[PDB]
Amino acid sequence: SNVADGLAWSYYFGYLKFVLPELEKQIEKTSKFRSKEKFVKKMFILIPSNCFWDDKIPGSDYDPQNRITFEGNTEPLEKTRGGVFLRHYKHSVYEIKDGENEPWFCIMEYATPLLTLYDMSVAQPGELSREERDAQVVVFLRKLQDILEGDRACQGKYELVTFSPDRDLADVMLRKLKDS
Amino acid sequence: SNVADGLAWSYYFGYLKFVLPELEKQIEKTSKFRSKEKFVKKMFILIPSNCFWDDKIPGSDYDPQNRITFEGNTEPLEKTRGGVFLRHYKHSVYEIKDGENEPWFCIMEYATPLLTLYDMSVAQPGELSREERDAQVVVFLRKLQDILEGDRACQGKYELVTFSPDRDLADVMLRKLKDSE
Ligand SMILES: Nc1ncnc2c1ncn2[C@@H]1O[C@@H]2COP(=O)(O)O[C@H]3[C@@H](O)[C@H](n4cnc5c(N)ncnc54)O[C@@H]3COP(=O)(O)O[C@H]2[C@H]1O
Ligand SMILES: Nc1ncnc2c1ncn2[C@@H]1O[C@@H]2COP(=O)(O)O[C@H]3[C@@H](O)[C@H](n4cnc5c(N)ncnc54)O[C@@H]3COP(=O)(O)O[C@H]2[C@H]1O
């Protein structure tokens, strides 16, 4: 009865499989990013425990100190899924202040299928309670990890960032960025 | 433990919930569509048994008689999911020849999460065999109906079209189109 299992597979085959092994090559297409130092070429997938987000990350409730700042989008990646439709995959680059030091540059994204988990818990409580939802998050997380790590082309090109709605996303990002 | 179960929920909350109760109102935004007769304002969701499609529907392997023809896109519906990003939901209108009679007009779409089922069966056979895939289709289908039918705003605004890769999608569409109220 685990909805998260099918949510992870879709995320991979319907998105990450295309965009993760070409991300680094796509970022370097722009001189500004090619020159930039302190730039991690890995996609940071934000996974809030409450599966919720309602606004842009700069000056967000997750960024009280106003450290995160939108810098711009990457080069669009042309791809067709099923041959039925042609899309342009692009990502957002954010600038994270590191105090007096040169600010960091990274690619952050939310796990869009997590909204489906939240939406369920609010629209159909008889199918998913706040407790089950919290469990499905863990399920989604671990299952996603397995899928990704089972792909050589995607290994080392991503990072799963799990945090609580109280934690400072800026303080969490840096702790990861340096360890990268 | 059904991958199809989670595939249906995402389809609804991440798409159909937004686009289905506003589809008819969106179609009438174009004069050409307001005038057009023999036009069903319901979204026809194509569900091939093999979870596969590789090209445009006009002149496709599902349309040997070459009756289906792209007519144009509907008016885009601006909507935000999570408020983080703004998208434009639009759909494709197709013209289905009905012999000597006036051709039909409808909105057909594929169930994009079905590709994930196919992709699995080819990339990870040890997780989904060709047989399980066929079973997950039924699961996805039956579950999807329930979710939709459980929403009053979406009722009567959709239709599930199930067919085999051998059947003529044009011959299948009409059989549904005519039977539609
Ligand atoms: N489920 C989702 N989660 C997170 N972000 C999403 C999203 N769906 C769309 N977006 C973002 O919104 C952009 C424009 O969406 P739009 O729906 O108006 O126009 C879309 C849409 O009509 C179609 N498209 C995108 N994803 C699709 C999908 N999974 N299935 C079917 N059509 C899709 O391709 C067009 C352009 O795609 P493009 O990626 O270059 O650009 C997309 C993408 O960046
Ligand atoms: N262009 C893009 N940019 C960013 N992320 C992308 C993306 N295309 C796909 N994804 C990711 O993969 C999932 C879509 O899986 P799938 O496309 O097979 O199945 C999708 C698709 O069938 C439908 N859907 C979502 N957005 C759509 C759109 N703009 N147009 C048409 N269908 C859409 O809803 C299903 C679940 O989508 P969900 O949003 O919950 O979650 C998305 C999203 O997490």
The string of DSSP codes covering B17-69 is HHHSSSHHHHHTTSHHHHH-SSEEEEEEEEEETT----S-STT-TT-TT--EE
Q: Name the residue in chain B with its Cα closest to that of A12.
A: B116
Statement to judge: residues B127 and B71 lie in one domain: yes
- Checking A34-41 for CB contacts under 8 A at 24+ apart, the result is A36/A105, A37/A102, A38/A98, A38/A102, A38/A103, A38/A104, A38/A105, A39/A104, A39/A105, A39/A106, A40/A104, A40/A105, A40/A106, A40/A107, A40/A177, A40/A180, A41/A107, A41/A157
CA distance B56 to B58: 6
Q: Where are the alpha helices (DSSP H) in B56-149?
A: 113-123, 130-149
Give the CATH number for residue A8: 1.20.5.5200
Statement to judge: residues A56 and A32 lie in one domain: no
CA distance A150 to B12: 29
Statement to judge: residues A11 and A84 lie in one domain: no
What is the Cα Rg of chain A in Å? 17
Number of domains in chain A: 2
Domain around B22: 1-39
Q: Which of A78, A75, A98, A100 is nearest to A88 (CA)?
A: A78
Report the largest interatomic distance among the alpha carbons of chain B, rounded to a whole angstrom. 52
A61 and A178 Cβ atoms separated by less than 8 Å: no
Q: Name the residue in chain B with its Cα closest to that of A151.
A: B123
Statement to judge: residues A70 and A121 lie in one domain: yes
Look up residue B144 and give its amino acid. L
CA distance B148 to chain A (A): 13
Residue A92 CA to ligand 2 centre (angstroms): 17
Statement to judge: residues B35 and B61 lie in one domain: no
A160 and A45 Cβ atoms separated by less than 8 Å: yes
Count of positions (residues) in chain A: 180
B88 CB neighbours in chain A (<8 A) are none
Statement to judge: residues A25 and A90 lie in one domain: no
Selecting from A2, A10, A84 the residue whose C-beta is nearest the C-beta of B10 gives A10
Resolution (angstroms) equals 3.0
Give the CATH number for residue B90: 3.40.50.12100
B113 in contact with chain A, both atoms CB, cutoff 8 A: yes
B68 and B96 Cβ atoms separated by less than 8 Å: yes
* Beta-carbon contacts of residue B125 (< 8 Å; ≥ 6 apart): none
Return the sign of the alpha-carbon dihedral for residues A17, A19, A24, A26: positive
Statement to judge: residues A10 and A82 lie in one domain: no
Statement to judge: residues B21 and B48 lie in one domain: no
Report the largest interatomic distance among the alpha carbons of chain A, rounded to a whole angstrom. 52
Q: Is the CB of A112 under 6 A from ligand 1?
A: yes
Statement to judge: residues B62 and B74 lie in one domain: yes
| Beta bridge partner(s), residue A85 | A81
Q: Return the structure tokens found at A32.
A: 């500004």
Statement to judge: residues A47 and A26 lie in one domain: no
Statement to judge: residues B27 and B47 lie in one domain: no
CA distance A110 to A60: 14
What stretch of H or E contains A172? helix A169-179
| Beta bridge partner(s), residue B69 | B95
End-to-end CA gap in chain B:
37
Q: Which of A136, A120, A52 is nearest to B151 (CA)?
A: A120
Give the residue whose CA is nearest to atom 37 of ligand 2: B14
Residue B180 DSSP code: -
Statement to judge: residues A96 and A179 lie in one domain: yes
Q: Return the structure tokens found at B103.
A: 């051709």
Residue B78 half-sphere exposure toward CB, CA atoms < 13 A: 2
| Beta bridge partner(s), residue B47 | B162
